Design a protein around this ligand. Sequence first.
Ligand SMILES: O=C(O)c1ccc(-c2ccccc2)cc1CS
Ligand SMILES: [Zn+2]
Ligand SMILES: [Zn+2]
Ligand SMILES: [Zn+2]
Length: 231
Amino acid sequence: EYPTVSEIPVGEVRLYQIADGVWSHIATQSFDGAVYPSNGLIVRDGDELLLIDTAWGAKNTAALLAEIEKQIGLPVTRAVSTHFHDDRVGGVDVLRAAGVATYASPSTRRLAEVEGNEIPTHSLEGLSSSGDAVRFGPVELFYPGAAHSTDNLVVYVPSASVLYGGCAIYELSRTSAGNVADADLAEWPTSIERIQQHYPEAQFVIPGHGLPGGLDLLKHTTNVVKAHTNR
Ligand SMILES: O=C(O)c1ccc(-c2ccccc2)cc1CS
Ligand SMILES: [Zn+2]
Ligand SMILES: [Zn+2]
Ligand SMILES: [Zn+2]
């Protein structure tokens, strides 16, 4: 039932209800010949919505907001980007223009600026050291340490036991390392271990790209990362 890349044309966005008050949003983007899916999160925040990550581009994120308005009808008041790549900050300018307060760690904002990517307006304090966690409305933000990128954050929804791993966590079907140009391969396994130690009760695990699953996705990602390390 989870939407796949074959069922979403580039420019469209699907919402998928994980639990009460928690959705993922799925978009697709063309890159280097192929088409890839990408996940973000939507968490109900009383009568407001917290958005986790853009839909990978200005056009996709405009469609994301229209699809949220259509299906959910509650306002997106804040957005958190979980690292500096375009599938997380691409569309921040659209969000800002729509009145959404955009957020990221100073680490993410710095690396976005260096890359020439869009830059969330607000800075999330208290996430500079591995193992740091802060509350942000209905979720907890956690910095496990460098992994897919030096700045990657994970998000936990305690009310629903939903762990959003972002692109530090791979889906089961992916057996080869993907975009690791900005990764810390040496620290990635240790960072995953911090996630496991902090959220052992998670019942749903959302990867940055592809099908959700359970906590198995963490060990799977470690396996793939170590295999690539010994390439
Ligand atoms: O922003 C980028 O450069 C980027 C490009 C490609 C992917 C990708 C590749 C294969 C399968 C799923 C996703 C991801 C990212 C940002 S993490
Ligand atoms: Zn990335
Ligand atoms: Zn503001
Ligand atoms: Zn990604």
